[model samples]
Target: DFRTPEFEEFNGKPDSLFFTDGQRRIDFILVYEDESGTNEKQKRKRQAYESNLICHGLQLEATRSVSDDKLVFVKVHAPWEVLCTYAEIMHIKLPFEKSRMNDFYFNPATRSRIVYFILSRVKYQVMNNVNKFGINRLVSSGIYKAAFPLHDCRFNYEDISCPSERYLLYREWAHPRSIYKKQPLDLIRKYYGEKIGIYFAWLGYYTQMLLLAAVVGVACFLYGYLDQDNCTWSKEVCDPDIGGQILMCPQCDRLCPFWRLNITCESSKKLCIFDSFGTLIFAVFMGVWVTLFLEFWKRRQAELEYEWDTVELQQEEQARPEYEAQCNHVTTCGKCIRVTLCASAVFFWILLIIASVIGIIVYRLSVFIVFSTTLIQKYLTPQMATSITASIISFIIIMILNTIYEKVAIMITNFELPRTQTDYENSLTMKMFLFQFVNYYSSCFYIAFFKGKFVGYPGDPVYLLGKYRSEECDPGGCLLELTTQLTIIMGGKAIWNNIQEVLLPWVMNLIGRYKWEQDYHLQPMGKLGLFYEYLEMIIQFGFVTLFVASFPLAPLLALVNNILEIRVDAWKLTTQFRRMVPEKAQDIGAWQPIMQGIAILAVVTNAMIIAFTSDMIPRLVYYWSFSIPPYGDHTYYTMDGYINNTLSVFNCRYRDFRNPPGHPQEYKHNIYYWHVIAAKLAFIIVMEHIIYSVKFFISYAIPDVSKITKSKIKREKYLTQKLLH
Candidate 1:
């Protein structure tokens, strides 16, 4: 019976010779009894008796007698066509009900003629169009659109007169004998019952969406209020002259023995007020938007449910007369089951909302406790300080605000605000702004703090510059003097000397290099030395060729290896030790490729300027009481003189002099590259856009199947198929 083909066979061979006439009737009775039986024994007895009757050709009629009052019979002419046509027309005007006027009849004869006319027209249309009436309509509109519009139109029929010609033509084709069948009144009642059930189902769906939206709104409000301090941090840094100092200064006396343990105070009261306003605005908007979404979904669900119910009813009406003269109790019971299912769904959503509220409260409390403890000095141990004090403080503030949110939520839930239209409007406006603010700031905080794990380190230039440059200098050197000396030295010929003398000497002095040389010259012990010697020999041979004839390959190879070495060293530094690169460095790693691109561009520009500038040539002349090159009467003819001229110009600029030919230049333009600056800016924009696009693609393209259960997936699939059909 579960298989469609089996059911089709059962439907087709009602009185087949597979059983005696008596046995066929008995089999039907036994099937009904077995299906409806509450006890196994009765079901078995009924099956055995039906089998015996089938074998013996003995008729066993099992008919349920009904009272006259309950057995009200209604004779319906063209019962199947009437309801089937009604359903078809009903579907046509489903959402828009203007074009369903063809199925109406003013009298019994008219109704019969209309049915006859439709059937004839459909057949004729099939012959001429080579498309059935339904098929042509389906292809004309979208297939599914045809179904609803046609179905709705079938139900839109009202009593209307047909033209005389149409009536005569229909009468000629109509089968008068087919109109005498008796139908149960229960058919129409069942149709209406299904429609009612569908309405309730939609009502339940809408209610659930509304409740969900309300919950989401409340959540947004709480989150906004809790995270308000994020905005104020930048403001404090930007305007430190007024209340900035007060905001910046920690309460020393209140500080715990361990600085990390200190209880960081919240932002000024004004900041809190601003934050609260933002939260309030977000909440209002969230509420209004959610309400609107609920309303929209509610209406949509209702319409769909209604359509489904109407279709079910029409089907039942068409089926009733063929099955039996008795009422279709099964259809009525099916509708009741549907209604019960809808009621259960409604109850489940109510329970879900209650559970969600409880969960939210529990989550908020847990967050609060963790946040508070992190912020409190008493819980923070000095030895365990993890350089995330600022983050912890921010977390504490969020938690406290969340805790306070519970009270606000309770107040709103318990006290119904004024129901006046103006109040509602104002509330909605405030809610929108507050919700938006909350969403934006929450995203910002997640990006800045949680996602990146950015903690505030004092922005003291001395500290930052010191930490960065120290790695390149002597560990025990006076850092300030070392920085000053390095800067001064790097600005002149000393930079070249540092590379050739200090760095080169340091590399050559390494014990590893000494050991390799010893292995190659004294012992000739391993292939490692041979490999090193081979590379050195190749380079030496290339250098001799470059000296004889200028080839750029050797220089290019050296540059490539130099760049490769830097990458290899960086990778090692990142991966190797307990004392790896700092957390801040890792957070900023996202921008490393961009910074490297800028550095490359700057190098190219500097090289181009050095190679092409007119300052490469030098000459001496008196200008503003100083001797100038290239423009002077004493022009240089040799390559050495030109090189010296360029060096002099460079030196003058480095010394920040007023005149070029003088010991100090009048105008200094050292390391200038405007094109490089523009390129650096462009690189930043491109990188940022690339990152954003990647994130957007990920968010939209992937489905959230992470926590879905198999049962949930199956149920979703079943619901989708049913609703889609």
Candidate 2:
């Protein structure tokens, strides 16, 4: 029934206009009844529909001379040709290549079954069971005018393709947008199975979610680019008194974050350009964007769950065999048995694992972000070295923590078997969230909150940036000044990760087998569980959205990367990797709330970016000139002895704009620091309230499912209640 152009009818025109050119290649469906029709002419008309005839689903194929004009004719692939393609869809090898089927006669009409490649169990689902209503209902109908209906086993036709089906092959995707075509999705769902299918489903959903964000990114990119006249691109300027390098300054050219591109909107009559208005739009957009995306995806996921028939299926299935109860007993009385775990013991065990994972990951992340970049910067060219060092060390920490966490998760799961596989997966995902949350945000958070600050449990308080040669701004909050380098590091990490994920497995196959090793590519099968895939995307989401204002180009790069990423991943799954025994998933489990949490954090991060990096906040306070202004445009000078003019090296500037040792207002840069900070914090609270408000409304604006399904469930409930009475 879904074979036709239902979507095209509703939407005016759809992306997919055709499903197939032949029937034999699609599905074999038979509708039959034992009793013959009495009207001779009508019976002849019905006979025409019964034979091997040409037919269509969504498109027309070929027209040929009618077979006696009395029989229906449809294009059908020969039975054997259907076998190979069906085998591929089912991911089978001819039932372990059984010899019993080796030499069977190949006539479709004479054979009891066209093919039986499935195992001996060969269970098939039954549709339209009429007997559940009572045995006499059919026999007593209209004085027994209707005989019982008998039909050949009907397989879902639209779901699979034939051996000669070249159009749907991954390589044959003729357009860049074909990846999103709904026609190919059925084949992807059936062939790729549930886990990857869930992954694919989310990728599509996310692409849809990012439409608004992408538009915002491109708009901001152009706005910032075109309005570069007043922007401040540097952190320092040439000293005219010394007659050194000079710039746009009445005295000197400013030393900026980038040499060619200007990113700064310097203090002006009304506002700071780059930081105040441009990023403000981005911040507001991301705030609402993330909120709406998270809410809408919930509704979208609900529909997919029903479509895939995976709704509550995990509860029906058994818990994984790997899980075991630490302090528990299985009691059996005759035939009935009950198993229970010790609640207190399980609780303590989980507590220990959770604590260890968080503590270790947080501590390791701090060391890498702070220490590793310092060491790497010492050896190579300043900017390049520092960027790679930071990202690479963060990369290593991600891998190490992932390995450590996965082992602990495995151990914890074995010790405490969750109620179902889905729950177990959610448990692992929660543990991962603990590490990733710290891993991705620690650097930016440190720079934002405790940057030039200090802490001490045992001794006098120590300044975080004071230990290093990092200089201070007026408020003295720029800790080690690592934002630029951090952005570069993140970009490198993203590039490194995607390459290995898609290209590595195939590269090995291309290299060919080494004696004892079977060629990796020959089988076209490689293990790619969904957990690892979801992990990368979650982290990448943080990279592109959270603190994206640090590197203005981040989202644009991600959009480009994902464009290639979708097709590359599709190619791998369709051709490079072996046929998957397509997984069954109603939704993307465990990762949904994880994304929502990150999006919430992204709002906070971008808000802080606007406050700290750009002069947005300072300039607002800058309006009250009578109240002291930020140290008069101080630029870098000598640090101890040598010239510290290197723009590439972060934290190279030495604090200079100050009064003599004990002046009264020397330490105070802005009297309104507290007020500005309060206002910014207040902004966060307001945004949170607004975001939550829309989320509440959206919950009612969209229903999770269609009216048809709700009616079916309601009808079933009524029928059950009536029967109970």
Candidate 3:
């Protein structure tokens, strides 16, 4: 009775996120500082933008930022009538979900998307002169500092009025405890966006496929290990009587002295583990694995398309705000010239990366001489030192150039701006992929194909730039060195990327949502947010496929990284960033074809690896052609005297397929060299044809859409048609 005498309470309730009437749902919010004197112009523009938003049938509610009077928050909602009016105009698909299902799914995202559509297209007039549209323009110009749709609820909490989707996602998908559970992809698509959902889907599928590859790859590695002791070439290299007395010619100009072949004993044994017959088998299996992966991915994506109701939906893309702001399209004649010029610019950048690679080669050449001459040679071999230092330096330069070229690629794409957001991203995709492909893979390609192949005999060594001699692979061949390079780049890239991903967001937030305000404090999801994720995985895919023979453990490494990558991405997407606009995509744009291209190229590269890069073909040629009665003195085909037969007798000894000194055409290519060349060419053709045929057969056999998905799609169409009539 004594406490009954209280003041009149406000009509609105605390939990109601609506207008005082408690009818329309709040969809989005904007935040800004309320400065009167200096920001009077901003206030006027803000007033105009809000007024235009109202003219487009959106409602706005302004309030003070919590604990701060100088900051203001503006809430936006689209009423039923406004949504209805624009739904038809925008061709927004209001699907028949009750005929299907969902209590908490789809409605909030659709409502938020409609509100954003209105917000992004409304116009604001500045002093009756230039007119500007798009919330992005306003946000960019700082007339309004922040604009975003609200999340369903806080990530950590849930009320009794049904568990919030955010909380459900946190517990079931995003939490570290949920690491082993299958992703709630439908829930993700309903909340985040279709593009993001598709990315996770693709990434998850890739990881699954990598499991099979990892298993097979590990098996191949074990096979290599088990067979290492049986490798005759390796055994011969380690034999003191066979390899110790052999004198190899000086590799470099004058600083490098003649070295014994037995010094490369351990390395030769190491090469046997990677360059064995099982490596050839793994290479072939990977070619088929890539084909199978791509083919099955098509089917999986088709199933997702049907399930998500994205089938037959044309991409209704909005012209990017940046494109509209630029206000200039292009001329047909000038466009051709611009495209040509852009291509030339891309080529110029690629050439720059090539120059860097050449510089690394020069570093190897110069550094090899120094290491061989130094006292360090007693402990570490010159080749190992040169390989390690050059690889580390190359990796460092690769990372540095990747950072720099990122800006360059964006600048180039902006210079050649396309109309729509999808077009912009696609264009940027092609440019970045080409540049990165060359940037990351050029060194590997050089090591596989070019290095040591053109080295003239010791008498007339090939000199790069007329000063330093071109570097040669170790006596174990280029496979071991290539393996080292792959391990460094692949491992370093994964480590650095994870550090940047995990630390950058956490650190940025340290400087910095109520539920809305706290959300505002989190990082804004950039336009190219998912782009980098896709690029990272695609680059890893290339590493696993392109030079896989050099490193069988690549798939295993990739599998581990992808599992961690999945959780890391889920955690960041759910908690560490603001909600992204829910945009629809039928599939992963541009990357599908990009991956297909890699699959096609993988066959050639792997075939070449077994044919030309590894010593398998030459050894086989020797075993069949030379080790028999034709060229060898052995009673039957055997590898007992392979090392002695392969090394031509120079003044002392050297690794080449040439005649001995005092012969008719001394130090020239012998009959054995041509025989090996013929065998290599023949092997390349046969392997390529067989692998391509298998790939084609598998691609043709695997249907794009599954039987179940096809049936469900037909059923949905039939139901929709009958119900509409």
Name the best candidate (by TM-score): 3
Q: What is candidate 2's lDDT per residue for 1-725, written digit by digit as tens? A: 22212111121211212223323231221111223334454344333322212221112122122223222211223245445433343332122011122222222211112222211112112232222111113223311111111111111111232232223444343223365444354445544455666676677777666656777776775665566343331222222233123121110112222221121112121122235356667777776777777766665665555444453522233324232334344323311322134334434444544454344334433443333234322333222233345455655655565567666655665455454646766766776666666655665555555443332211123433355222123112232234444555466556766676656765665677652001112233322256766776787788777876544556666666665565666655444443333335555658767777787677766766666554445344433321232422334321211122211111122222222224455333324455556665776677667756765776667676545546655665666587558
TM-score of each: 0.19, 0.56, 0.90
Shift of residue 522 alpha carbon in model 2, Å: 6.6
Model 1, 1-725: lDDT tens digits are 11111111122222231122221111111112222324465344223322322232223333221322211111112344353454464332222122233322322222333332332233222223312233333323322111110000111121132223222212321112112222222221222222222322332333343344335434543453466453332233224343222222111113322121012222221223222233223323332332333234434432443333222322111111011233655455664785577435434533433343233323432343344344433433221122133233333443344345435433442232323423332332332223322321232222212221111212112322244310111001111121122122122222332344345534544765676000011111221111222222222222212111111122233333322322222222112111110000001121223222332332332222212211111111111111235333443322222212222132211111123433242233222222223443444455335434543554355433323333444664666577567
lDDT of each: 0.27, 0.43, 0.76
At residue 363, candidate 1 shows an lDDT of 41
Our model 2 lands, by Cα RMSD against the true structure, at: 17.6
Quick one: ranking by TM-score, best first?
A: 3, 2, 1
Deviation in angstroms for 572 in model 3? 1.1
